[PDB]
Amino acid sequence: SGFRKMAFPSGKVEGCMVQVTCGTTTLNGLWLDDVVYCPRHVICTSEDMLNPNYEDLLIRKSNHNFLVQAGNVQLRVIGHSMQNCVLKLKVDTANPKTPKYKFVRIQPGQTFSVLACYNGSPSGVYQCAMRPNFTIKGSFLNGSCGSVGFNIDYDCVSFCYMHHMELPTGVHAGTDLEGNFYGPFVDRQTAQAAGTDTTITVNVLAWLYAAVINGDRWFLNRFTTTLNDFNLVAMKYNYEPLTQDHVDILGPLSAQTGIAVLDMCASLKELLQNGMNGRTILGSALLEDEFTPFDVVRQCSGVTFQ
Amino acid sequence: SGFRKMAFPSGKVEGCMVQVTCGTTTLNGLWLDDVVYCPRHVICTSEDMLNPNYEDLLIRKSNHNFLVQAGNVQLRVIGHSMQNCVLKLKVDTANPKTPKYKFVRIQPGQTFSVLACYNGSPSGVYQCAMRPNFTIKGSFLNGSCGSVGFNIDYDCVSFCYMHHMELPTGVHAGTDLEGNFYGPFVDRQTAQAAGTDTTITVNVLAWLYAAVINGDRWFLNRFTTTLNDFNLVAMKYNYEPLTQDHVDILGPLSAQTGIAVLDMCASLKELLQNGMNGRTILGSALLEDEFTPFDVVRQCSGVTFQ
Ligand SMILES: *C(=O)[C@H](C[C@@H]1CCCNC1=O)NC(=O)[C@H](CC(C)C)NC(=O)[C@@H](NC(=O)c1ccc2ccccc2c1)C(C)C
Ligand SMILES: *C(=O)[C@H](C[C@@H]1CCCNC1=O)NC(=O)[C@H](CC(C)C)NC(=O)[C@@H](NC(=O)c1ccc2ccccc2c1)C(C)C
C-alpha cells in the first residue's frame, strides 16, 4: 500500500544520452543505433534564437562542426539531416546499449517519465503529464534541451518527448522524436501563447480509485449521476468532458473497486461543488490529475488497502 | 525553472537487482561484488512470520536452499550468513555491473530514491524521506521486500535503505544495509507502534526557498524573527525545532536568495498561524517537507525563476 508519483526506471534511457556541441552551444542528444537525435537549435547562437533561419544555419555546417561525446569517447559524425525541429546526426558507431524502442506521439492527458540531463549526463527522473494545452510541467534548466520523455512497456522504450523550450509561466514545450512540436509552438525566442489548461477528468477519477484502493474512502457518497449531468457540472470547474471511452478505460479500476464509474463521478461532483472542507485525499489537499488509469493499475493492482 | 519531486537516475542500481527464492518465499536481493543482500525473512513461511526464530530457520538451510536469479541466469550460492536482519549470500560470480558504492545509515529528515522491484525486476522509482519517527511513506506491495533506497553522489551509490515491512497506517519500515532497523521495529508480523510523526522544518524552509527561486513570492512578509521565538510557534504545529546547524545548512539558499534564514522563518511563522487562505505555493496547497536543502540546490541552482 501507499501511493507515490512514480517514474519508470531510467537505466535503459541513461545508456542512450550523449553530449552534442556545435561551436558555442551544448545540449543533450539521444543515441540510438548509429543516429544521434537532438534539438536543431544546437546550431544557433544566442543571437540567432530571436528568429533563426535553421536551413541557412545548417547549410553552413559540415559533419565536423558537430562534436558528439559519449562519456570520455568522441563519436565521429558522418552525416547530418534536419527532420522538422530535430537534428539527426549519423555517427560512425552504433550504440551498443540501444534498447528495444519505438517513437510514439502521445495524446493530451497521458503521462511519461522525463530523464533530465545536462551535458549528456542524467540529473534526475520524474513523472510528467502532457497537459490538454500541449505543455508539460517539468523541471528544466539551461542545458537541459535534448532531454527525453519516455514510457517503458516491458522491455520496449517508447520515446514520446524531446525537450526544447520554456514558457514564462514556468511551463515547458517540446517535440516528439520526429521533430514535430506538441501544441502550437515554434522553436524561437518569442512570445507565443498557449491554450488555457484544463483538468484531466479521467485521471482525477483514476486517482480517486487509487485513494479508495488505499483506504481513503471518506469522499464516497451514496449517489450516482448520469454522464451528461456530471459533464455539465465538471465543465464549470474547467474539467475536460468525460467520454464513454474514458468510462471504458476506468473499467478495471471500477471492477477492482465495486464502485461504478458513475458512482465515483457522483462523488467527484460533490467534491467539486463543496470542496474538501480541510480534509486530504492520499495526503493531498487538491485533486490530482497526473496519474492515468494505467498508472494507477500499474502501481496498485497488488495492493487492496481498502 | 519548475520544481518537481525528482528521483536519482536508477540505472546503476537496476544492474544490481536479483531475485532470491528460499522454498516458498521470493523477494529481491542486492548483488554487489560476489555477495547478495536480502531481508532475512526470505526464509520464513507465512506461518513463521507471526514470531519467527530466524537462527533456527537459518540453521536448517544450506547454500542450495537459496535460488538466486539474475535475469535468465542462475547464481550458485556458496556461503550464507545472517547480519542483524539481513541475509548475505556469497555467490560464485561477482556482479560485472557493481557500481562504486557505500553503505550509509541516514538521519531522519534526509531523502533518498527508492527503486521498487518485484521478482528482481524494477517497477518504478520515487523519492522518499526518512520521517522523524523512522518510517517512510513509500509505495510497496507483496514481493517488494529487498527493494533498496539510495543516493548518488557523483559516480558513487550510497545505499541507505532495504525494505522489510508495512505498518497498517500505510507507512513502511526497513533497515540499513547492515541489517539494523530504522526505528524501534522488528521483522515480525505483530503490532509495534511508532512515534508520532513531525514536520521536517528545515525541509519546509528549503522548499520555500525553491518557491522563491521559482517566482512564487506572495508569502514573503516584511518581518524577521529570532530562532527561539520561531521555534516556540513551530513547536505547537508539530514542527521539529530549527537548530543553528539547520540555519547553517540553509546558507547557500539564503545567499542565493538574499532572504535571511530568520526572515524566511518569519514568513513560515505567518503561514503556520494564518494558513494559506486558498493560495498555493509551487502548485501545492500544503507545505512540503520532503525536499532537503541539498535537494533544492541540486535541482534549482541553474534556475533563478525569481
Ligand atoms: C534548451 O536547453 C533551453 C532550455 C530552457 C532554458 C531556460 C530554462 N529552462 C528551459 O527549458 N531551451 C531554450 O533556451 C529555447 C531555445 C529556443 C531556440 C527554443 N529558448 C526558450 O525556451 C525561451 N523561451 C521563450 O523565449 C518563450 C517561449 C514561449 C513564450 C510564450 C508566451 C510568452 C513568452 C514566451 C517566451 C526561454 C525564455 C529561454
Ligand atoms: C516483503 O516483501 C513484505 C512487504 C509488505 C507486504 C505487504 C504490502 N506492503 C509491504 O511493504 N514484507 C512483509 O510481508 C512483512 C514480513 C515480516 C516478517 C516483516 N510483514 C509485514 O509487513 C506486515 N506488517 C505487520 O504485520 C505490522 C507491522 C507493524 C505494525 C505496527 C502497529 C500495528 C500493526 C503493525 C503490523 C504486513 C501487514 C504484511
Key words describing this protein structure:
Thrombin, subunit H, 13 strands, 26% strand, 3C-like proteinase nsp5 (chains A, B), 306 residues, binds the ligand *C(=O)[C@H](C[C@@H]1CCCNC1=O)NC(=O)[C@H](CC(C)C)NC(=O)[C@@H](NC(=O)c1ccc2ccccc2c1)C(C)C, 7-stranded antiparallel sheet, homodimer
Any overview of this molecule?
Two copies of one chain form a homodimer. Chain A has 306 residues and is an alpha+beta fold. Among the domains of chain A are: 11-91, Beta Barrel (Thrombin, subunit H), CATH 2.40.10.10; 201-301, main proteinase (3clpro) structure, domain 3, CATH 1.10.1840. In chain A, 22% of the residues lie in helices and 26% in strands. The first copy, chain A, contains eight helices and 13 strands. Chain A has helices at 11-14, 54-59, 201-213, 227-236, 244-249, 251-255, 261-274, 293-300, and strands at 17-22, 25-32, 35-39, 66-70, 73-75, 77-83, 86-91, 101-103, 111-118, 121-129, 148-152, 157-167, 171-175. In chain A, the strands form two sheets. Chain A has a seven-stranded antiparallel beta sheet with strand order 5-4-1-2-3-7-6, with no helix packed on it. In chain A, strands 8, 9, 10, 11, 12 and 13 form a six-stranded mixed beta sheet that branches. The relative contact order of chain A is 0.14. At the A-B interface, helix 1, strand 9 and strand 10 of A face helix 1, strand 9 and strand 10 of B. One ligand H6F binds at residues 27, 41, 44, 49, 140-145, 164-168, 172, 187-189, 191-193 of chain A. Chains A, B: 3CL-PRO exists as monomer and homodimer. Only the homodimer shows catalytic activity. Interacts with host FBXO22; this interaction promotes the proteasomal degradation of nsp5. Chains A, B: Residues 1-306 are cytoplasmic.
